[PDB]
Design a protein around this ligand. Structure first.
Ligand code: SF4
Ligand code: F3S
Length: 106
């Protein structure tokens, strides 16, 4: 499984979903997650993300380990996203800001 980490929050560029072969992505208000069971580990999404938020499970940063579990339980409750959409409004202002999980919206 691949995993969406902190930088996606409040950016949500949704470029990653345009390459997904299966329905691996689940949309939140200001964040996306990857269903670990859907994910075929194709790895196409990871280069697409402008926020560089996506990592292979095996490679999630130490400080971002909570996101492995977070994507797994949030994907059981959010709707599937299959189509790209515009980024959120302050997306470039929020790109690269750290600590954004404090801003996560369910
Ligand atoms: S690695 Fe492929 S299957 Fe997994 S989330 Fe990315 S696009 Fe989807
Ligand atoms: S910012 Fe988030 S919506 Fe996709 S393109 Fe990156 S993981």
């Amino acid at each position: 499984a691949f995993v969406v980490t902190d930088n996606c929050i409040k950016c949500k560029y949704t470029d990653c979903v345009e390459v997904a072969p299966v329905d691996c992505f689940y949309e939140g208000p200001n964040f996306l997650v990857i269903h670990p069971d859907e994910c075929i580990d194709c790895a196409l999404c990871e280069p697409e993300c402008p926020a560089q938020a996506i990592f292979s499970e095996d490679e999630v940063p130490e400080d971002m380990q909570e996101f492995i579990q977070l994507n797994a339980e949030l994907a059981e409750v959010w709707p599937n996203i299959t189509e790209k959409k515009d980024p959120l409004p302050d997306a470039e202002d929020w790109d690269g800001v750290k600590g954004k999980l404090q801003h996560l919206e369910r």
